[PDB]
Design a protein around this ligand. Sequence first.
Ligand SMILES: Nc1ncnc2c1ncn2[C@@H]1O[C@H](COP(=O)(O)OP(=O)(O)O)[C@@H](O)[C@H]1O
Ligand SMILES: Nc1ncnc2c1ncn2[C@@H]1O[C@H](COP(=O)(O)OP(=O)(O)O)[C@@H](O)[C@H]1O
Ligand SMILES: Nc1ncnc2c1ncn2[C@@H]1O[C@H](COP(=O)(O)OP(=O)(O)O)[C@@H](O)[C@H]1O
Ligand SMILES: [Mg+2]
Ligand SMILES: [Mg+2]
Ligand SMILES: [Mg+2]
Lengths: 372, 372, 372, 7, 7, 7, 300
Amino acid sequence: DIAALVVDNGSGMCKAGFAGDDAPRAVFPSIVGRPRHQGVMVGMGQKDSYVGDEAQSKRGILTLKYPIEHGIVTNWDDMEKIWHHTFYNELRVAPEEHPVLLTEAPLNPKANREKMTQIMFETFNTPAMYVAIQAVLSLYASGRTTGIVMDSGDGVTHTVPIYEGYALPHAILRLDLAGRDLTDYLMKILTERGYSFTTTAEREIVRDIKEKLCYVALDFEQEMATAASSSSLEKSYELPDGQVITIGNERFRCPEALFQPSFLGMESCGIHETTFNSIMKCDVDIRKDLYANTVLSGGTTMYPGIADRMQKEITALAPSTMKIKIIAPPERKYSVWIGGSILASLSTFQQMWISKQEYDESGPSIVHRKCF
Amino acid sequence: DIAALVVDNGSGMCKAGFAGDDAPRAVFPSIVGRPRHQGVMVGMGQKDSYVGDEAQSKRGILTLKYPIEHGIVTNWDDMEKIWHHTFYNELRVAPEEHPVLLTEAPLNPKANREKMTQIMFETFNTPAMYVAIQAVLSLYASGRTTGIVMDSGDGVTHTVPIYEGYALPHAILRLDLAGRDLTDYLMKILTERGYSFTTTAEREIVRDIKEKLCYVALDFEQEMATAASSSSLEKSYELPDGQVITIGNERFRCPEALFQPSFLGMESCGIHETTFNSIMKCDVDIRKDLYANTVLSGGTTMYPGIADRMQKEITALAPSTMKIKIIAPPERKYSVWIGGSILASLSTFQQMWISKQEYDESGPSIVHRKCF
Amino acid sequence: DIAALVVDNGSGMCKAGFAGDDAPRAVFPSIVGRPRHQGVMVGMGQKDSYVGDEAQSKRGILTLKYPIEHGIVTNWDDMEKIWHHTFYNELRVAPEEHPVLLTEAPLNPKANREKMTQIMFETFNTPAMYVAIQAVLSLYASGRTTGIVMDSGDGVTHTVPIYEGYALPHAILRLDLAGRDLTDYLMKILTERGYSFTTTAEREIVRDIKEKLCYVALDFEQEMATAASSSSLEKSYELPDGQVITIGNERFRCPEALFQPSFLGMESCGIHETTFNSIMKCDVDIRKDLYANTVLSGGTTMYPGIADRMQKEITALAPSTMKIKIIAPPERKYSVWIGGSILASLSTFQQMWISKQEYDESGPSIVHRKCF
Amino acid sequence: WXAXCPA
Amino acid sequence: WXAXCPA
Amino acid sequence: WXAXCPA
Amino acid sequence: MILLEVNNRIIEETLALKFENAAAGNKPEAVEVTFADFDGVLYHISNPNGDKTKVMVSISLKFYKELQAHGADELLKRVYGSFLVNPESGYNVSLLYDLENLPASKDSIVHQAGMLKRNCFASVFEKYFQFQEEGKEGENRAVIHYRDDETMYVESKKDRVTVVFSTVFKDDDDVVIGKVFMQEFKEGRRASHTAPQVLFSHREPPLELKDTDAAVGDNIGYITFVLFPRHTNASARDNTINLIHTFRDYLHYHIKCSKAYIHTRMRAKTSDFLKVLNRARPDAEKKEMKTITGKTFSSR
Ligand SMILES: Nc1ncnc2c1ncn2[C@@H]1O[C@H](COP(=O)(O)OP(=O)(O)O)[C@@H](O)[C@H]1O
Ligand SMILES: Nc1ncnc2c1ncn2[C@@H]1O[C@H](COP(=O)(O)OP(=O)(O)O)[C@@H](O)[C@H]1O
Ligand SMILES: Nc1ncnc2c1ncn2[C@@H]1O[C@H](COP(=O)(O)OP(=O)(O)O)[C@@H](O)[C@H]1O
Ligand SMILES: [Mg+2]
Ligand SMILES: [Mg+2]
Ligand SMILES: [Mg+2]
């Protein structure tokens, strides 16, 4: 009927809900788990593949695979499983009664969104759908019309400046650097202390450590000198078997990769230089407004002390006269979903859906012209 | 015998040679590479930086930077190394034994040529030097005394009308739109297929792809429809690791940006309108002589079928009673240098150098009084 | 010039010698024996700890303990005993007069090399030492400065790619899977035939059976179907007490675990896929040079027909135009040591020591500054 | 991805 | 450049 | 090791 | 250290030691410490007439006359309060700390006592900053003889403050390297979007020095800073004064570190040439293995 579904099915965590709400109804990690041991106990609830929280709980005897990586969908069967579990189990609502509004990172292979449309119209049989750039929605959520937004999800980072509603499509920048790579770097640097997490089941433990102890340093060299001459920066985390580990210097060497990709052997610049360059790509007269309306977004920007570091870096790069204001909302994990909800609930948006008849008339490729 | 050196020293490709020849002695990309890792093997080639073809060969472990950007030198510590490698490694000749003939795009910061003169005199101690405009040398190489040159250099495009040897410095036009911008545009539009090129070593591969497969369309919409309706326009290229990519529609979308800067988010007009406007800037009584002597140049005008597109566009723009004749020699890639090897070899030119004592008397600002 | 002791001392077997030779002077299993029964015959002389070959010969009444497990020193007293036996009994040289070049696998805990330096400086009073990475020495021994070393020791496997000397530290793949895991797996699968080796003295018998009879099958399923349909692969080995056992299918089932650790209940990929991943993590411009310079080492790569298996497996994962060369020299087992003697005999290496004086003022924290 | 990066 | 465009 | 694996 | 600092270390050390000895309640000991600074400045910390309870810090400068002009002591008075007393015979400025009337927080007065020379300079310099802030054109323009053969011509206008350094180095090597270090000084304005207009000249003196006695000649270089009201406001004039004050000394410092920099590259190239020579020594057939000390091996 109405209240189209909003499914921010980005990398790392799928967040689905109804339009007109202020919070996603069901958020869960988008992983597919398959058992890697033979079953011996018959009639004990043996299923072939777990998805979401079911896989997270029983991850001891499962191999976990993310169907998304860096923003592109690599295994479409697992993605179909994820969408099915989202619709029927985590929401208990048929897909052929509501439109759906997915999301996509900018500068993405067109085959991705084409297959998204084909799946949404031929497997789940939705009456309509739409695809939006996650940055534009995150800007919707903040209730602004001007500003640059630097989203950073599980596997993709991207900056999209928008002035007075006109997004500059030539200044949109992308950088494949996000949670996934930080969790790999942490798994690597933890071996320095002596902790070895190798299997995909322990990657979740390392991710829980990263999203509980890590923090962005306001001055990397000074924090490194401090953590090397004291023990006031060490924190102890307890593995789920009783073992307790203590991480010190590592806590801020993991997120620092965001500002120095040279750690990961990447040539690209940090996220601060990425945002500054994205701003400088735009016309002169607007470079002021963006300076005062930098809007962080994505889970990877939930590190304590990232707003201050970004502000310091930018105000050290930008001219001294201009003002720098980092609009880091209290919550920004669901900001993309909040913006998607606000967009779907708009009354002027009902003329922009991709209708079933339109897909049956023009095939999947219509998504290239109906959606921006 | 002793003869002046002619150093093109473009924005993307440095070409140097001796005056009085018909081909540049040394041609190499004007890049500087520095390693981004740490050697571990004792005594194996530990040196600060590679320059020229050596950097291209070892581009896997280096970060490449271009000293000249948009026809402007933006890193002098690297331009000095470029000229040093040209003198002592490529030409293998002492710098203080021959006059030098440098080239510069028109409408350029005076500080650029002032620093050029200061470097050529204080550092390398050349007994004489000269900084001529590139389009004038291109016209000299063409072998005529009237016409409009359209030097679509790799780093910069510019048109300079000349009549009876009288350059019109109020009709010169410059457009910062050339090979490097097309390379970046190809990198940006290749992601639609799914190929992701980010690092500089990959930008070199993208340039090698552009320089080989791209071509300009005689009629854009027709070619787009043809490429969409039939898979008979796709080409295959093998990256230097065994991978094979197939590019179709993209082939004629990269060079099409030259005629439609709106793709690159620029307010400017295509090179056809630039040439037409530079012609209409002249007084009427000579315009015909320009219409029949339009000359191309630069490595960015080597795309197949660019003469036809330019002639069609100009014929559509200009009146229907003027004979348009796009003079496009099959050797244009070196015309800017060829004319140099002519100009430095003339006998009526040996009194137009900038002698060392003239500089010692009047400071580096003498380049504005001597060089036009 | 100065004579510097080179002590590989990897897991499994300690191989020590002098720098400048072509083979280690003394190679003995790194085990420590302890009597597990009462002494009743007084007057014959007794010892409370046997080390090396003596502990091997008397293994019938000892509890063999390895001081190193998975490349990490886990019992430092037995490690000091091993080093003392190496210095004063095998080489019969005073350690307080010669430098020492020890080896460590990559991605080990820093406390390991720290305590190693502390032991070598405060117990034996060596005037200088150096802790090198094993694969780098293995590449030295092969006489080339480019390639990916695939070192599979007795307790750890790891690959290191190096290009022109600049090792890429962000693509070093480690994998805790080596000869000891294969020996335990052989002990497990030997029960199904009917033989039971369960004590640590018989693990040596199983290791001898492995390194004398086991080999790698080029096509696993074909060899399984063959040895399961005809008795033409069975081999008979005589235990040290006259019993003879016959092993068939097991012969190639033990080393096959290297190419699919799902047998050991591990999730990580095989060694071939590990090497291929390590290669694919490097930049695109060097992969072609790595494919043709794959180097094997360690005594676990001495299985008959493992070079052909690795070639056949990598060729299936690499593009059909890359040439795959598996450079496996017949002296692969000692390669890590041979590269060491090459290194410690160089002239500039005297400037890379850790002088005893430099340690006396800075403690064990100097190894992280002087040795990568 | 297909060329460059994995995805 | 110094003002306008990068170079 | 201390966490993960034995060593 | 890249940028030279403005606070003197000996003054701070001596005064902090005296204040720690006085605050603990120990009896005061004698003090007589004479030393120097950059630009030929001479410091003298002593006691007035053997009075071991008072410490007098005197300073002799090179801009002797410009500081005696009316209004050139506003900043000195404002910052030093009652510590400012009559100059000691032979010196130019003099502070006097009574070791029995020292206020609490002895760190601030010592931090302001180590910057005595910087404050004497900023006092004779903020005159023109004010002449420009108050919106008056044609205010007094002078020549501070901050050294003995070099000058700093200051001029204040309605909308700017022009500072022209007439500078010359003593040694020939320093002159030859300083020509380069001053030619390449206009290439610094590419490092910041807001840097004062810098002009370099050694062909002829600027048109500001044609009515004044600033040092001119054919061996002198002229460096003109044009400080605009965004570098001389009441919030960013401290940094501007520090930089204009230590500019010449900073250039001299880095000229003298350029040589210790070049020496490393020369050692590297010397070793690279030794490696080319080494191809002439025929490789031995057998070498005797020695020890770390160099004695015979004593074993196989
Ligand atoms: N508070 C946090 N601290 C550190 N990392 C976080 C935090 N919250 C989320 N992340 C990481 O950032 C990534 C992106 O988070 P999320 O908002 O779910 O975007 P996505 O849906 O694209 O994963 C996640 O993979 C997560 O591991
Ligand atoms: N045949 C070709 N087709 C298309 N582009 C080309 C061709 N040859 C060269 N180019 C591009 O044009 C540029 C060569 O221009 P060049 O004559 O070297 O001027 P510059 O000296 O300014 O680089 C390079 O950037 C190259 O990528
Ligand atoms: N020639 C061989 N054929 C088959 N297996 C071998 C051979 N040589 C050694 N091995 C096995 O490889 C294992 C580990 O190799 P090793 O060289 O001992 O590692 P490390 O170099 O760390 O000591 C040994 O336990 C041994 O049984
Ligand atoms: Mg997101
Ligand atoms: Mg050119
Ligand atoms: Mg080994």
